[PDB]
Amino acid sequence: GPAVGIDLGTTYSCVGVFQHGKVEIIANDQGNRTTPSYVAFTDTERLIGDAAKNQVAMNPTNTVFDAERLIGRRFDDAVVQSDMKHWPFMVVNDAGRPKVQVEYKGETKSFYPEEVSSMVLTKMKEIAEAYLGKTVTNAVVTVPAYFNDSQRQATKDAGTIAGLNVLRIINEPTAAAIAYGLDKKVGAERNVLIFDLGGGTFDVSILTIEDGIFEVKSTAGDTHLGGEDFDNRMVNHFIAEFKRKHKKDISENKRAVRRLRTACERAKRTLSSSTQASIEIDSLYEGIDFYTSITRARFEELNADLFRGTLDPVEKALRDAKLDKSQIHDIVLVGGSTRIPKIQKLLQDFFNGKELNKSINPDEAVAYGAAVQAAILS
């Protein structure tokens, strides 16, 4: 093609291409190495990625996200029914299949999850093509290891709809392991633990690898734990702060909250590299600006319980895999949230000082491995 590797995440998607013995994680039009898995519909246009997320605060009802939580599932599924209660967009039942319903150009329209995901994939495909200056057709698309046949089929379909020839659908943890060359033959079997804390989900997977063959020994985690929850803790903290300083509660102003959240998410990223971050919002509420700051220590305390809780699934995964900590040959960090220093400390401490594989940007590791595999299969 060359063939590309695409990591379709619940919050962000990433595309990479292997060329000249090296993987290139491709930046988008805005120079971002990952793209929001968002799609929006307006009176005049369909927006995807950065353009869609950049307007979610003003168009919550027609801005779709979390299609990954619906893909391949039935409308009557317990989790689907539960998730619906939290989404600002409508999810309808079409013969037992869930579809997101939105307004586009003044008319009501509905899309299957795979159609929404195909839109995101199309964006990733175009991002790769702009970089390569060539048409991209072949691709390896990844999915959470626990995905069933239906979810895998629907994901492949999303690719096909986008004009991609899906060479293979592979597990995210396996892609991560491949990124670090853990698939190479070294004689005996090796146990690898993948600690994946993304934007909306937490996945711990223990893989056993031998002769280039992967076996998913166990999986654990929380489908509703991720970076967004950390942003939430910060949002609540600042709503309280604004209330103290201005005797005004911004909680019911959906837009103000979303704008504060965006500022929090950015502040959070800064706290992974610096011990303090500044938040400066204009016209947050009733023309009142919100200029303040937060320390790394403060950020850690606001999320202490959530951070510490990530170790429970690690213990469970080990137990289910019938392995002691000492039997894990490698620990691979995946997901943007694993860039948080406190998370790395907790995991490393749990593993008695064992070093973590974190040289590859965690939020790019899956796409990196998928790109390598795509090359191999091409």
Ligand SMILES: Nc1ncnc2c1ncn2[C@@H]1O[C@H](COP(=O)(O)OP(=O)(O)OP(=O)(O)O)[C@@H](O)[C@H]1O
């Ligand atoms: N430097 C950073 N420090 C802390 N968090 C970060 C950093 N960079 C990105 N993140 C967070 O990582 C999350 C995105 O991670 P990633 O791109 O792995 O998500 P994803 O694959 O869509 O998630 P999931 O697999 O849970 O669906 C967001 O919550 C983002 O705020």
Ligand SMILES: [Cl-]
């Ligand atoms: Cl773009």
Ligand SMILES: [Cl-]
């Ligand atoms: Cl600690």
Ligand SMILES: [K+]
């Ligand atoms: K992703």
Ligand SMILES: [K+]
């Ligand atoms: K994840």
Ligand SMILES: [K+]
């Ligand atoms: K997941």
Ligand SMILES: [Mg+2]
């Ligand atoms: Mg992910």
